[PDB]
Amino acid sequence: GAMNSSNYAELFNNDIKLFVDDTNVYRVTVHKTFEGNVATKAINGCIFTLNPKTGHLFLKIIHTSVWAGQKRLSQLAKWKTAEEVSALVRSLPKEEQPKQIIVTRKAMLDPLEVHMLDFPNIAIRPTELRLPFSAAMSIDKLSDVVMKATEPQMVLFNIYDDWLDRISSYTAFSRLTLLLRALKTNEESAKMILLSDPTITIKSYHLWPSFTDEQWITIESQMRDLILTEYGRKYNVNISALTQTEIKDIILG
Amino acid sequence: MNTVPFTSAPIEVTIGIDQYSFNVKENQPFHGIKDIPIGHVHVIHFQHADNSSMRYGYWFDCRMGNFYIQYDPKDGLYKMMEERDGAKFENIVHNFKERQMMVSYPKIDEDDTWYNLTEFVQMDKIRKIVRKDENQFSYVDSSMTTVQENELSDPAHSLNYTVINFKSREAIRPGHEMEDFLDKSYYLNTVMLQGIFKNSSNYFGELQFAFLNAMFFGNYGSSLQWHAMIELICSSATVPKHMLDKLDEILYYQIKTLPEQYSDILLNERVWNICLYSSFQKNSLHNTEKIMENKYPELL
């Protein structure tokens, strides 16, 4: 049925699955016109299609040309997302095709089901998880390839860099969701935590800095502190008085 | 004016004929129904006083043979049978009429209600939905499942309604996913009207037959089929003017006839709200929207 804390461990089993997040497909700046009306200007977007086990990210760049002369763009965006996911599945060899696709937003269910009728054995599922994949465009190298695109493009990344050499996919996903949650809650503060030791760089072939195991623990702690600080600043709550149980709950929650 | 005689009424039963009903006591000298209007299909239906789970009936057309009802004490139900001997049948009906042992089909002269519910319903189409080719009449009951219900068990005792599934390859052309899902015109006009039904009359006949099975037997699969056929039209941007005007008439009489006390089990909130207030046809069903708003405003 639905993906919850029912079992999170299903994400890291040997059944190929993808998350699909459509948050960044249709992106606009809202602006005043000369006559003082309001107009939107589309900017380049992306589909975020992620294997949570392997870290393989199929970033389909949505060029603004897709929208030209189309109506009801927020509706069309869901159908274009479903079209591109179905095209990706058909492009993969059978043994690489997912058994399940999990959409981060329930509005993607019917469009993806209708585009995948040819794949009756691929389960299309919602999730109860609040996943911070909208923050993907806070990763500088992903933002760069999207905004520079002059045409439709698929780019393949590993969103875990080389982490799976040292940690399990459960831990790698937990690190990824904590980083993205922090980038989503306070982007500038998250970037400062990630990039304020010039000695630790990002490899040309990576997305995130080259932290040692000990440094990842420190980074992870600073991210948790950021999310707790922002929860405090937001709700007018003294975060001094919070227990490890209280804190645990707020970050997961 | 045709007659369906009864051998006897050995068990207490509520007997339905079309939209009419009357109570018969155990061993009451009831010997049938006379003055049945020629030109329409009819349904004779039963609910036993001692077991309301026994809800069942027979669709027939008196132009197609001489039919009677006889209680079967083994199978425990009123069965319809055909009498082949014209002269025996005429003689039985004459004796019962003379002894005034028959109820009269109680049609008011002004009243077009039954025509209005059965306008497109043909006995030959019923017999293709309800398959028992050795009989000219068709048995339906409250528990019979549809071919579509059996896909999601006994294939001989099923209602063979036309399968409608909005998320099926039949419904959606490759390359026209969004278009065909959001606007069901291709599915309605090419697949169903041109392809399967051949014309709107056969489509409405099945729609009307589904409603009547839903209302008279509480048949859940029939109710699903009635709503699916309404929703396929209401969800199509392109529908012939004549079909929308006729649909408005069909639905008006169905809603007019539905007992108020069954509206909560026979009417699907989602479909009716969508059809009347969100769909392409939201402004095309004037008569239906007015009766629904005046009779069932809570549902909406």
Characterize the structure shown.
Chain A: It is found in: Nucleus. Chain A: This is Pre-mRNA-splicing factor 8. The complex is a heterodimer of chains A (253) and B (300). Chain A has a six-stranded mixed sheet, with helices on both faces. In chain A, a hairpin with a 5-residue loop joins strand 4 and strand 5. Chain A is of the alpha/beta class. The radius of gyration of chain A is 19 Å and the shape is globular. Chain A contains seven helices and eight strands; from the N terminus they run βββββαβαβαβαααα. The longest helix of chain A has 23 residues, at 213-235. Chain A has helices at 73-91, 109-115, 140-148, 169-185, 187-195, 213-235, 244-252, and strands at 17-21, 27-32, 38-43, 45-50, 56-62, 100-103, 123-125, 153-158. Helix content of chain A is 37%, strand content 17%. Chain B has two domains: 1-143, Substrate Binding Domain Of DNAk, Chain A, domain 1; 144-300, Alpha Horseshoe (Serine Threonine Protein Phosphatase 5, Tetratricopeptide repeat). Chain B has helices spanning 86-98, 113-118, 123-129, 147-151, 177-182, 185-197, 200-217, 220-234, 241-257, 263-266, 269-278, 286-295; strands at residues 2-5, 13-17, 20-24, 32-36, 42-48, 51-60, 66-72, 77-83, 103-104, 138-141. The A-B interface holds A 75-76, 79, 82-83, 110-111, 113-115, 117-118 and B 167-169, 172, 174, 177-178, 181-182.
